[PDB]
């Protein structure tokens, strides 16, 4: 069974064919691609070592960024797994790994990377999901010179939570793309700027990673599953020392639905035992982490496993971090969208089974750097319509056709809206330059 993640049906990439995406080139600096991996093995993927950094195809241990981030652009169709922007082993692909493990190892610059992509890689795209707080001339013209030679380049805004400028995603010759939810809403770590330029799908985002890195969730009602409606497995912490460490609990757990209403901010769970308790969440991430308020809840009235379902105030998809202090929650627990929350309680009462797996090849991960692979995969899909166009006449194309998100017009948060690729496309098929 292969499942189309959220992201990749809100920016329109499922209706359009990467047939030609062979004419274009997209090279992705990050930690790595694990080639081995089933779903990313057959793609037209080529890659240029660094001493630094050991093979490209290797991404190594606990370094699967660059490999989800690959997924997203390219997760092949197969019935298995999930499936990137451009699933037809279509379109070419270049690695270039500048992070280990431990970090940043690339035997020189960022710059230099880029060059690589671009001379070694024939790119015609250079997607970043990385960034810095620095920024330098020499580095803003090297990448002013990439873009009006005719190289699309596009990098994560940061999750900071706040106003600063992460480069290269800050430069004038860069795309600054956003993270926002499967409810349009505005991460709340996405870093807002006047540089922001356009959204991109950044919160619980399946996607491929290192063999055996991963975790899944599940949810089965009559013999048939939710895991296409969104199941995401509790991002469990707990103390560690002078910090917070994952403590993920991957088991199965079964028992007659149940929910624990939310009445103000109060709970009227009952009694629990033997059953799987669906709950509201209360609260949000952001200032805090308030997950552990809904689930803790149901698991003092003894609860065997744990649904936690989205609020009002953010009904999308939520991949929030589950704070347990006291170390509580040790049976499974999951979170899914309002949507799939309010379809359970019509099967209320009914034998359900929540899981939570280890040992994956697929996660779901937040970020802006997951927004920028769905931005630069669009990007290199809707360019393949018409290679003849520019970079600059790309990069036009995708923000006079993006759908505007919050407030009218540009914001910081979202720039000029979640990134549309059949209006993109629609928009090129007039002219370069659009009707
Ligand atoms: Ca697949
Ligand atoms: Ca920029
Ligand atoms: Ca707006």
């Known amino acids: 069974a292969e499942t189309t993640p959220w992201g990749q049906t809100f920016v329109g990439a499922t209706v359009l064919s990467d047939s030609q995406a062979g004419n274009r080139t997209i090279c992705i600096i990050d ?50 797994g999930v499936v990137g922007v451009m699933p037809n082993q279509n379109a ?46 020499t580095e803003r013209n090297a990448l002013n010179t990439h873009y009006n030679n005719g190289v699309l380049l596009i990098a994560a805004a940061g999750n900071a939570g706040d106003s600063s400028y992460s480069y290269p995603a800050s430069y004038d010759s860069v795309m600054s793309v956003a993270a ?48 296409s409606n969104g199941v995401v497995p509790h991002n469990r912490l707990t103390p560690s020392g002078t910090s917070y460490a994952p403590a993920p609990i991957n088991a199965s757990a079964t028992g007659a639905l149940a929910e624990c209403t939310v009445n103000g901010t109060s709970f009227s769970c009952g009694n ?74 019509a099967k209320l009462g009914q034998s359900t089974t929540v899981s939570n797996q280890g040992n994956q090849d697929y996660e779901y991960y937040n970020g802006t750097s997951m927004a920028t692979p769905h931005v630069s995969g669009v990007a290199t899909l809707v360019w393949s319509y018409h290679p003849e166009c520019s970079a600059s006449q790309v ?34 098929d007039e002219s370069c330059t659009g009707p």
């Open 31 to 80: 930690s790595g691609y694990d080639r081995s991996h089933n779903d990313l093995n057959a793609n037209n993927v080529t890659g240029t070592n660094n001493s630094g950094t050991g093979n490209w195809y290797q991404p190594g241990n606990n370094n699967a960024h660059g490999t989800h981030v690959a997924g997203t652009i390219a997760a092949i169709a197969n019935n298995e």
């Open 92 to 137: 070419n692909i270049h690695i270039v790994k500048v992070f280990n493990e431990a970090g940043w190892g690339y035997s020189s610059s960022l710059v230099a990377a880029i060059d690589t992509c671009v001379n070694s890689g024939g790119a015609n795209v250079v997607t970043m999901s990385l960034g810095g707080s620095g920024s330098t001339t």
């Open 180 to 227: 926002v939810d499967s409810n349009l809403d505005h991460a709340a770590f996405s870093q807002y700027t006047d540089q922001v330029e356009i959204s991109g799908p950044g919160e619980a985002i399946l996607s491929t990673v290192t063999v055996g890195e991963g975790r899944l969730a599940d949810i089965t009602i009559g013999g048939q599953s939710y895991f």
């Open 272 to 345: 629990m035992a033997n059953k799987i308790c669906l709950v509201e969440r209360v609260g949000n991430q952001g200032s805090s982490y308030p997950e552990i308020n809904s689930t803790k809840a149901c698991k003092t009235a003894g609860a065997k496993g744990i649904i936690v379902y989205s609020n009002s105030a953010l009904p999308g998809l939520q991949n929030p971090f589950l704070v347990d202090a006291n170390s509580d929650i040790t049976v499974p627990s999951v979170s899914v969208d309002r949507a799939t929350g309010l379809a359970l309680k």
């Open 395 to 428: 990069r036009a194309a995708l923000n006079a056709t993006a759908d505007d998100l919050s407030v009218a017009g540009r914001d910081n948060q979202t720039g000029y809206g979640m990134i549309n690729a059949v209006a993109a496309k629609a928009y090129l």
